[PDB]
Amino acid sequence: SGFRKMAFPSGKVEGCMVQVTCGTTTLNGLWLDDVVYCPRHVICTSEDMLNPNYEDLLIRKSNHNFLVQAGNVQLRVIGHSMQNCVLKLKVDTANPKTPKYKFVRIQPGQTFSVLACYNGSPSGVYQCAMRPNFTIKGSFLNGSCGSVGFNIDYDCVSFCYMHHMELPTGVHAGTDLEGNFYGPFVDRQTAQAAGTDTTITVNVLAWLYAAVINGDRWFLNRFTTTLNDFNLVAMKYNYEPLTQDHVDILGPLSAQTGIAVLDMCASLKELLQNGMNGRTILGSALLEDEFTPFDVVRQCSGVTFQ
Amino acid sequence: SGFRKMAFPSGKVEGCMVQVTCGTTTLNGLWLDDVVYCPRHVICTSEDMLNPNYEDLLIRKSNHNFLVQAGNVQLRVIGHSMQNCVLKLKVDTANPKTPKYKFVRIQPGQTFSVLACYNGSPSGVYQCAMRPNFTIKGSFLNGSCGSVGFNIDYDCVSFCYMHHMELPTGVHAGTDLEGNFYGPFVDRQTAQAAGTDTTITVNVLAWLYAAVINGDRWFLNRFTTTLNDFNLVAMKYNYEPLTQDHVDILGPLSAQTGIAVLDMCASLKELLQNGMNGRTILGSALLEDEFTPFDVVRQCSGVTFQ
């Protein structure tokens, strides 16, 4: 019993975190085989940041302007190159602790674990969701750039996020591990609007199933709805539309609980329209949308990893 | 910016988790040097559990009734003994991955990371608090017994909890690593009442400071209070009394925010009496008490570990 915001075990990622310094700027890098990945804005000065020409700035850099450290170990940079917004520092020694890994680009609404780091050392781990507007609501201080987000599938770490920036609005933005930003954001110090953020509807349904599995079910009603009628109510409340793919993904939780997906949708419809009347669900007074159906199934059935 | 429920990096603990089987019962053990620790109820049958005589049951067990596994590796048990409620299985090989470690008994109101495991394999990591009534609100399925809770101090893992049981009430109970239960609980299948649970007042104040540091401060008022007057209000709402030691612990957050501790206490007093009027604090519609002052300072200043 019980339901918690749960991150993946971080051990396989911990052994990959190093420190990257360029001038006065220190941030984190990801050391896999003989390559260190980090945000390319590490090469900017405080004057460069307002409108950097990264091609020009990188040409001005030498290998020895990049100070990479793993623990007590200095890693010698053999070469530097740029893939989109990510710097690749080839080093002369492959990380002996390199796990089996993939680089993946995740979908808005999907979740991942962040290993927040400073000076190449792990500070803590927590679960995030990629918001529909391609931001994340992280916990990041100065020096946290280069921290990565990841999932674990069997024995393979799927790296999906590298932290680049905090926007003037306090929210967080970054790239996949090929250096492509999630969302419309650019790595320059300028005002950048994120989109209207919406609530991840399929995730809220998943969490309501989690509540039911844990005996918390006061919100259930005796109604059903059509996908079309539910959606007409959900857009009024800034909830993402629900698709048939979403209904199909919730199938396993429907079967475990004996509650049809469209019946749970009818329950959510009434919660949106009436509120919670001062009650709580799974210890929360608000509807939670940062758990995917898979997260719920993994937590309520005990999926483990090598 | 941002504030999240953050666990310690789990890598040093991951390398210590093994599987312990006795008969049909499989659970998790903690392998440090040449000793495997696990709950002593692993030796019970389904009939033994209602009123086990653990001394008698253990005498009936042979070394070969304990099947210990670390990955593909079978660990040969050289000896078995009982320290309070914890079984100690001496094995013939010391864990090469044994980190520097301590065993500690934590205080109600203090927090720790749980590495939830099944079949000796890590499933996920999440932060808990030791409730004032010595339970924890975990996420634990069958087979999760033997999962441990821990803190990290510099380069040393301080093990503080081992999971033993889910009570008929859905909440979770366990021991320190010397096998002494937290709280009044016993390892037999009988109805056991936990105490009235109370809210950890110093933790709520810490989280209000966290909100202020993150720009979330609508709840501040222009009042102060005495420790005595605050406490008279707090007991009405099932909040633990606040001591001078608690005020002293909050000093650093008071200095960072420019808000005196007794001024924050005056703000909490009014939140308890008036509610939140449909607002939120750090993305929560309820007052949160599972962050210690140290947790806030570590997260808002970036404490890291070896």
Ligand SMILES: *C(=N)[C@H]1CN(c2ccc(C(F)(F)F)nc2)C(=O)N1c1cncc2ccccc12
């Ligand atoms: C991460 N280490 C810092 C740096 N940073 C940043 C640097 C350069 C640029 C630009 F525009 F591309 F040149 N943009 C951003 C940034 O945003 N950082 C960061 C990240 N997360 C949180 C914080 C909190 C406080 C200060 C900086 C943060």
Ligand SMILES: *C(=N)[C@H]1CN(c2ccc(C(F)(F)F)nc2)C(=O)N1c1cncc2ccccc12
């Ligand atoms: C943990 N593996 C299980 C087993 N267990 C338990 C076994 C024996 C005894 C007794 F009384 F000492 F003999 N008491 C308890 C227990 O409580 N487990 C457990 C722990 N956390 C969560 C769950 C969820 C579902 C089923 C069992 C759980």
